[PDB]
Design a protein around this ligand. Structure first.
Ligand SMILES: *[C@@H]1O[C@H](CO[C@H]2O[C@@H](C)[C@@H](O)[C@@H](O)[C@@H]2O)[C@@H](O)[C@H](O)[C@H]1NC(C)=O
Lengths: 215, 209
């Protein structure tokens, strides 16, 4: 199969700016048989351009596509608010038909450091035998943030799961939730539980913690 | 101009066989190559294969041993069978059709998609625990399958809370978990509600001091 590699993977621009996205093929594609789609969360992909540079009915002419051979490109001359989403390219010059990995176009804004919250396991949850410690960072930008768990300063590892929201539509920020999961034995067995966060809008890491009991 | 409806079972166990159907209301059923494509959550799209009204098919070679596509020209429907699933087959499955009979296989008509989860677990409604800070309060939904949960928060004086925030679900040990939070600026509690195919549940979340 022909592999298609799209870059960048993430594009931060502002409403009104110009976006230009790449789709490189690992072989040349016959007759410029390449197409681009738009995808919004929970929806099917929608056709924008077919045959590398023709536009589909109803597509505004700020979208345009060119290329040939093994380098195809997609230009959106003036980002409008509905344009922020995920774009895929696809070749149909030879079977099997294949698709690239997508590039997401996100809104750029002023950096914002997160608020951090820590929460201990409930008594009910403890009574059932497992422990879930929850760390919550809210409203930050950009998106990259590291969360490290500390139990009696013994840097934990391989036992936490993270989940990130979609860029919020009011203020364009992100929120993230982290979960440390222990057995009741293990939880009981230690004393200081801490959540440590590094984020470019912070000058040094922030730490939040609680002691088992006093809560 | 053309409508594609999809249906089929959404939760299976390792090594059972996936079966989906797509029906067409709209132009001619006749010379197009109808396709099946799919998308694992978080990852990109992958084409599986295609078929026309007279039975010739074309498959992606990395699934060719486990796949079968077929058509029913009597009801205008076509369908996909994928055997021996494992957890890697979980994904949203779409059907689609190219704009002309005589051209590139690119797609301008799609169905809405069916999410199919493959797990060793067995359907189950969430169990809920509260999250009080040791203002921000929270709620934990745990051990649910499949992944279709919804959250809503209310005041003791029945009326909606709207300073709300919810996070995608995580997958640990064949089942899922998810957390929701409210940010508040008497009443001795606030209410956390979730809805799920196997059962709706409630839990009061205490206010801290
Ligand atoms: C319904 O409750 C609304 C919010 O309740 C606040 O009340 C504070 C006293 C505190 O205990 C918190 O629980 C809440 O922030 C309140 O604003 C409405 O007025 C209430 N009743 C009516 C008439 O709607």
């Amino acid at each position: 199969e022909i592999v298609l590699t799209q870059s960048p993977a993430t594009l931060s621009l502002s409403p009104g700016e110009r976006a230009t996205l790449s789709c490189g093929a690992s072989q040349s594609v016959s007759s410029n048989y390449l197409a681009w789609y738009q995808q919004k969360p929970g929806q099917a992909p929608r056709l924008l351009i077919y045959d590398a540079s023709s536009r589909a009915t109803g597509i505004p002419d700020r979208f345009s596509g060119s290329g040939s051979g093994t380098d195809f490109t997609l230009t959106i001359s003036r980002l409008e608010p509905e344009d922020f989403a995920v774009y895929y390219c696809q070749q149909y010059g030879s079977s099997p038909l294949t698709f690239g990995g997508g590039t997401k176009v996100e809104i750029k804004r002023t950096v914002a450091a997160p608020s951090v919250f820590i929460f201990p396991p409930s008594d009910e949850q403890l009574k059932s035998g497992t422990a879930s410690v929850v760390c919550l960072l809210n409203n930050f930008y950009p998106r990259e943030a590291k969360v490290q768990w500390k139990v009696d300063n013994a840097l934990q590892s391989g036992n936490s799961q993270e989940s990130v929201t979609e860029q919020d539509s009011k203020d364009s920020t992100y929120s993230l939730s982290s979960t440390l999961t222990l057995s009741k034995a293990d939880y009981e067995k230690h004393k200081v539980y801490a959540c440590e966060v590094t984020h470019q809008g912070l000058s040094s890491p922030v730490t939040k913690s609680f002691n088992r009991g006093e809560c | 101009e053309v409508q594609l409806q999809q249906w089929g079972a959404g939760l299976l166990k390792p090594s059972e066989t996936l079966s989906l159907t797509c029906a067409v209301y709209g132009g001619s059923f006749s010379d197009y190559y109808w396709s099946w494509i799919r998308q694992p959550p978080g990852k990109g799209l992958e084409w599986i294969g295609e078929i026309n009204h007279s039975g010739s098919t074309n498959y992606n070679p990395s699934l060719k041993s486990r796949v079968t596509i077929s058509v029913d020209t009597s009801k205008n429907q076509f369908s996909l069978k994928l055997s021996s699933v494992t957890a890697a087959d979980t994904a949203v499955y779409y059907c689609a059709r190219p704009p002309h009979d005589t051209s590139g296989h690119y797609w301008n008509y799609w169905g809405q998609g069916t999410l199919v989860t493959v797990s060793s677990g067995s359907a189950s409604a969430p169990t809920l625990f509260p999250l009080v800070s040791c203002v921000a309060v929270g709620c934990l939904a745990q051990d649910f399958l499949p992944d279709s949960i919804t959250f809503s928060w209310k005041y003791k004086n029945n009326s909606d809370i709207s300073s709300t925030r919810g996070f995608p679900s995580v997958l640990r040990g064949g089942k899922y978990a998810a957390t929701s939070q409210v940010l508040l600026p008497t009443d001795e509690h606030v209410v956390c509600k979730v809805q799920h195919p196997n059962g709706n549940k409630e839990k009061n979340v205490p206010l801290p001091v």
